[PDB]
Design a protein around this motif. Structure first.
Motif, PDB file in Angstrom:
ATOM      1  N   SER A  50       0.922  -1.004   0.103  1.00  0.00           N
ATOM      2  CA  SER A  50      -0.369   0.014  -0.174  1.00  0.00           C
ATOM      3  C   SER A  50       1.097   1.476  -0.198  1.00  0.00           C
ATOM      4  O   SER A  50       2.153   1.104   0.875  1.00  0.00           O
ATOM      5  N   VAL A  51       0.488   2.195  -0.573  1.00  0.00           N
ATOM      6  CA  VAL A  51       1.471   3.611  -0.728  1.00  0.00           C
ATOM      7  C   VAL A  51       0.981   4.677  -0.590  1.00  0.00           C
ATOM      8  O   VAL A  51      -0.807   4.833  -1.205  1.00  0.00           O
ATOM      9  N   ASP A  52       0.606   5.777   1.094  1.00  0.00           N
ATOM     10  CA  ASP A  52      -0.199   6.443   0.398  1.00  0.00           C
ATOM     11  C   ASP A  52       0.901   7.418  -0.572  1.00  0.00           C
ATOM     12  O   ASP A  52       2.368   7.442  -0.394  1.00  0.00           O
ATOM     13  N   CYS A  53      -0.065   8.277  -1.408  1.00  0.00           N
ATOM     14  CA  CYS A  53       1.164   9.097  -2.212  1.00  0.00           C
ATOM     15  C   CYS A  53       1.948  10.272  -1.176  1.00  0.00           C
ATOM     16  O   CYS A  53       2.908  10.470  -1.463  1.00  0.00           O
ATOM     17  N   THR A  54       1.134  10.691  -0.342  1.00  0.00           N
ATOM     18  CA  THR A  54       1.179  12.073   0.450  1.00  0.00           C
ATOM     19  C   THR A  54       2.736  11.829   0.890  1.00  0.00           C
ATOM     20  O   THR A  54       2.926  12.997   0.918  1.00  0.00           O
ATOM     21  N   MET A  55       3.714  10.875   1.908  1.00  0.00           N
ATOM     22  CA  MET A  55       4.328  10.922   2.547  1.00  0.00           C
ATOM     23  C   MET A  55       5.978  10.484   1.124  1.00  0.00           C
ATOM     24  O   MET A  55       6.432  11.289   0.716  1.00  0.00           O
ATOM     25  N   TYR A  56       4.610   9.377   0.456  1.00  0.00           N
ATOM     26  CA  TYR A  56       6.070   8.924  -0.757  1.00  0.00           C
ATOM     27  C   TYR A  56       6.164  10.454  -1.593  1.00  0.00           C
ATOM     28  O   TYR A  56       7.435  10.559  -1.837  1.00  0.00           O
ATOM     29  N   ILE A  57       4.901  11.618  -2.022  1.00  0.00           N
ATOM     30  CA  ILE A  57       5.381  12.094  -2.591  1.00  0.00           C
ATOM     31  C   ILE A  57       5.483  13.820  -1.643  1.00  0.00           C
ATOM     32  O   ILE A  57       6.957  13.593  -1.820  1.00  0.00           O
ATOM     33  N   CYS A  58       4.726  13.718  -0.953  1.00  0.00           N
ATOM     34  CA  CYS A  58       4.742  14.965  -0.136  1.00  0.00           C
ATOM     35  C   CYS A  58       5.856  15.434   0.954  1.00  0.00           C
ATOM     36  O   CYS A  58       6.097  16.283   2.532  1.00  0.00           O
ATOM     37  N   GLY A  59       5.798  13.592   1.722  1.00  0.00           N
ATOM     38  CA  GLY A  59       6.107  13.742   3.373  1.00  0.00           C
ATOM     39  C   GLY A  59       6.490  14.529   4.350  1.00  0.00           C
ATOM     40  O   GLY A  59       7.591  15.054   4.873  1.00  0.00           O
ATOM     41  N   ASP A  60       4.906  14.674   4.935  1.00  0.00           N
ATOM     42  CA  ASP A  60       5.500  15.550   6.192  1.00  0.00           C
ATOM     43  C   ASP A  60       6.225  16.935   6.114  1.00  0.00           C
ATOM     44  O   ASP A  60       7.612  17.126   5.979  1.00  0.00           O
ATOM     45  N   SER A  61       5.690  17.782   3.845  1.00  0.00           N
ATOM     46  CA  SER A  61       5.953  18.951   4.196  1.00  0.00           C
ATOM     47  C   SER A  61       5.069  19.309   3.896  1.00  0.00           C
ATOM     48  O   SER A  61       4.004  19.099   2.708  1.00  0.00           O
ATOM     49  N   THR A  62       4.212  20.517   4.635  1.00  0.00           N
ATOM     50  CA  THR A  62       3.092  21.466   4.159  1.00  0.00           C
ATOM     51  C   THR A  62       3.438  21.671   2.820  1.00  0.00           C
ATOM     52  O   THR A  62       2.528  21.603   2.300  1.00  0.00           O
ATOM     53  N   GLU A  63       4.507  22.530   2.463  1.00  0.00           N
ATOM     54  CA  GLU A  63       4.796  23.336   1.994  1.00  0.00           C
ATOM     55  C   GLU A  63       4.347  22.509   0.436  1.00  0.00           C
ATOM     56  O   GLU A  63       3.835  22.912  -1.072  1.00  0.00           O
ATOM     57  N   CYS A  64       4.572  21.122   0.666  1.00  0.00           N
ATOM     58  CA  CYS A  64       4.566  20.008  -0.779  1.00  0.00           C
ATOM     59  C   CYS A  64       3.502  20.062  -0.607  1.00  0.00           C
ATOM     60  O   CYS A  64       2.932  20.103  -1.960  1.00  0.00           O
ATOM     61  N   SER A  65       3.098  19.417  -0.147  1.00  0.00           N
ATOM     62  CA  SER A  65       1.131  18.807   0.170  1.00  0.00           C
ATOM     63  C   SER A  65       0.249  19.968  -0.735  1.00  0.00           C
ATOM     64  O   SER A  65      -0.314  19.615  -1.539  1.00  0.00           O
ATOM     65  N   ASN A  66       0.401  20.794  -0.265  1.00  0.00           N
ATOM     66  CA  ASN A  66      -0.107  22.087  -0.647  1.00  0.00           C
ATOM     67  C   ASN A  66      -0.254  21.670  -2.304  1.00  0.00           C
ATOM     68  O   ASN A  66      -1.024  22.301  -3.062  1.00  0.00           O
ATOM     69  N   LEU A  67       1.126  22.196  -3.002  1.00  0.00           N
ATOM     70  CA  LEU A  67       1.689  22.273  -4.201  1.00  0.00           C
ATOM     71  C   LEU A  67       0.823  21.047  -4.640  1.00  0.00           C
ATOM     72  O   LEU A  67       0.095  20.575  -5.584  1.00  0.00           O
ATOM     73  N   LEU A  68       0.317  19.501  -4.329  1.00  0.00           N
ATOM     74  CA  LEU A  68      -0.411  18.821  -4.299  1.00  0.00           C
ATOM     75  C   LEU A  68      -1.016  18.693  -4.692  1.00  0.00           C
ATOM     76  O   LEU A  68      -1.891  17.934  -5.937  1.00  0.00           O
ATOM     77  N   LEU A  69      -1.866  19.394  -4.073  1.00  0.00           N
ATOM     78  CA  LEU A  69      -3.786  19.991  -4.158  1.00  0.00           C
ATOM     79  C   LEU A  69      -3.645  19.932  -5.540  1.00  0.00           C
ATOM     80  O   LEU A  69      -4.520  20.323  -5.666  1.00  0.00           O
ATOM     81  N   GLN A  70      -2.804  21.065  -5.449  1.00  0.00           N
ATOM     82  CA  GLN A  70      -3.079  21.691  -7.451  1.00  0.00           C
ATOM     83  C   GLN A  70      -3.407  20.867  -8.290  1.00  0.00           C
ATOM     84  O   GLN A  70      -4.045  20.572  -9.482  1.00  0.00           O
ATOM     85  N   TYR A  71      -2.571  19.376  -8.204  1.00  0.00           N
ATOM     86  CA  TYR A  71      -2.544  17.895  -8.613  1.00  0.00           C
ATOM     87  C   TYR A  71      -4.208  17.625  -9.482  1.00  0.00           C
ATOM     88  O   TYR A  71      -4.371  16.732  -9.970  1.00  0.00           O
ATOM     89  N   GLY A  72      -5.048  17.631  -7.942  1.00  0.00           N
ATOM     90  CA  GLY A  72      -5.920  17.175  -8.025  1.00  0.00           C
ATOM     91  C   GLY A  72      -6.306  15.608  -7.572  1.00  0.00           C
ATOM     92  O   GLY A  72      -5.285  15.384  -6.932  1.00  0.00           O
ATOM     93  N   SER A  73      -7.033  14.494  -8.136  1.00  0.00           N
ATOM     94  CA  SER A  73      -7.132  13.560  -7.521  1.00  0.00           C
ATOM     95  C   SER A  73      -6.563  12.820  -7.912  1.00  0.00           C
ATOM     96  O   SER A  73      -6.702  11.307  -7.992  1.00  0.00           O
ATOM     97  N   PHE A  74      -5.322  12.748  -8.663  1.00  0.00           N
ATOM     98  CA  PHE A  74      -3.908  12.010  -9.065  1.00  0.00           C
ATOM     99  C   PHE A  74      -4.031  11.359  -7.858  1.00  0.00           C
ATOM    100  O   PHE A  74      -3.952   9.895  -8.533  1.00  0.00           O
ATOM    101  N   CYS A  75      -3.432  11.160  -6.157  1.00  0.00           N
ATOM    102  CA  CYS A  75      -3.547  10.833  -5.457  1.00  0.00           C
ATOM    103  C   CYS A  75      -3.967   9.537  -5.160  1.00  0.00           C
ATOM    104  O   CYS A  75      -4.918   8.599  -4.866  1.00  0.00           O
ATOM    105  N   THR A  76      -5.646  10.007  -5.025  1.00  0.00           N
ATOM    106  CA  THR A  76      -6.777   9.719  -4.174  1.00  0.00           C
ATOM    107  C   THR A  76      -7.035   8.704  -5.230  1.00  0.00           C
ATOM    108  O   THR A  76      -7.815   7.573  -4.505  1.00  0.00           O
ATOM    109  N   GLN A  77      -7.122   8.749  -6.514  1.00  0.00           N
ATOM    110  CA  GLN A  77      -7.196   7.629  -7.865  1.00  0.00           C
ATOM    111  C   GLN A  77      -6.230   6.669  -6.938  1.00  0.00           C
ATOM    112  O   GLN A  77      -5.809   5.582  -7.465  1.00  0.00           O
ATOM    113  N   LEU A  78      -4.942   6.908  -6.995  1.00  0.00           N
ATOM    114  CA  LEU A  78      -4.038   6.022  -7.180  1.00  0.00           C
ATOM    115  C   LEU A  78      -4.224   5.307  -5.724  1.00  0.00           C
ATOM    116  O   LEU A  78      -4.190   4.156  -6.170  1.00  0.00           O
TER     117      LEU A  78
END
Lengths: 96, 96, 48, 48, 48, 48
Positions: free
Chosen positions: E1-29
């Protein structure tokens, strides 16, 4: 039985269309390769589609940006092609 | 040729170019042939010999000895790609 | 097909020099099948 | 508004002299490095 | 199982917000992997 | 997120870069959709 077999000879000889199940496989692959080959021509936003041109055209500091555009795009195309093949291969293996 | 840069083998060709046509292209949208700016002669460009390299070895536990496979190449070229002529005699043994 | 057909033409040329087709032009090669067409017939003949 | 256009062709070009001139404040090229320009050959060059 | 959030953004708020811009790519994955995850169990139940 | 606003607000030279980002995303999304689509269809076919 004997007469029956001869009929197949005629049907196969008469029309190629019987062979569509094989032909499409060859066709599809050919198409995939053609599409894959054709991609080389796309600019992808780069000033030009030719690597040797870009190299001859720009110094490295600037060239790196343009080439990068092609690499991300071309690779993505290649990535697209591979995924298609895996899926398609699965279908064939299913048939196998 | 006139800024068109590339690598390949230039050979005399038997293409019927029209007097106006500068050069030709393949399906790939890559230069198939060119005519010399100096001499009105037609040359087909075939990219120089290359191919995949694969190593056929038995298990390393079994032995160190190996056999190399040069994919889709005539045996003649192995010395050519390698530039065997330049190398030391130790290397040359492998060439042919 | 355009490219595939072009590739076949490549096999045809004896005269051309330094003609290693595997290369088509851009790294796209075609590996031969392990069981040759002649061999495939023998299986089928045996199977027959 | 009137900008003049001149057509230049049928020759060989030495652009490096242009580049190696202290005289030009701005020499920016979009697409060619100012160097290595000597290597290119073109159908028509227009100067404005 | 893989959470995108850590795998991509791991504990970086500055990162995560930028992730949201990406939309649903994570939630789908993440959904697919979960869907995949349940699938194997379904396989085991079907087999055994 | 809207194509028109980019055109409206930004000059094309600036807009081109912006739209390009938007293009890659959706194209990527459709790519994800079709790829996702192909697999499910295969699942259906086996079932069929």
């Amino acid at each position: 039985f004997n007469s029956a077999i001869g009929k197949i000879q005629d049907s196969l000889s008469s029309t190629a269309s019987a062979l569509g199940k094989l032909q499409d496989v060859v066709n599809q692959n050919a198409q995939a390769l053609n599409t894959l080959v054709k991609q080389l021509s796309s600019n992808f936003g780069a000033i030009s589609s030719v690597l040797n041109d870009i190299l001859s055209r720009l110094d490295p500091p600037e060239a790196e940006v343009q080439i990068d555009r092609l690499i991300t795009g071309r690779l993505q195309s290649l990535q697209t092609y591979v995924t298609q093949q895996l899926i398609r291969a699965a279908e064939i293996r299913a048939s196998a | 040729f006139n800024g068109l840069t590339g690598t390949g083998v230039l050979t005399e060709s038997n293409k019927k170019f029209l007097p106006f046509q500068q050069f030709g292209r393949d399906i790939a949208d890559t230069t198939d042939a060119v005519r010399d700016p100096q001499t009105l002669e037609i040359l087909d460009i075939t990219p120089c010999s290359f191919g995949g390299v694969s190593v056929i070895t038995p298990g390393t536990n079994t032995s160190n000895q190996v056999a190399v496979l040069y994919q889709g190449v005539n045996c003649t070229e192995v010395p050519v790609a390698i530039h065997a002529d330049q190398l030391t005699p130790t290397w040359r043994v492998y060439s042919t | 097909a355009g490219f595939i057909k072009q590739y076949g033409d490549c096999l045809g040329d004896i005269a051309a020099r330094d003609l290693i087709c595997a290369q088509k032009f851009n790294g796209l090669t075609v590996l031969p099948p392990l069981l040759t067409d002649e061999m495939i017939a023998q299986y089928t003949s045996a199977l027959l | 508004y009137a900008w003049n256009r001149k057509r230049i062709s049928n020759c060989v070009a030495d652009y490096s002299v242009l580049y190696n001139s202290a005289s030009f404040s701005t020499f920016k090229c979009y697409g060619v490095s100012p160097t290595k320009l000597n290597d290119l050959c073109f159908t028509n060059v227009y100067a404005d | 199982s893989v959470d995108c959030t850590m795998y991509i953004c791991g504990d970086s708020t500055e990162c995560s917000n930028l992730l949201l811009q990406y939309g649903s790519f994570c939630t789908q994955l993440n959904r697919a992997l979960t869907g995949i995850a349940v699938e194997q169990d379904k396989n085991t139940q079907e087999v055994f």
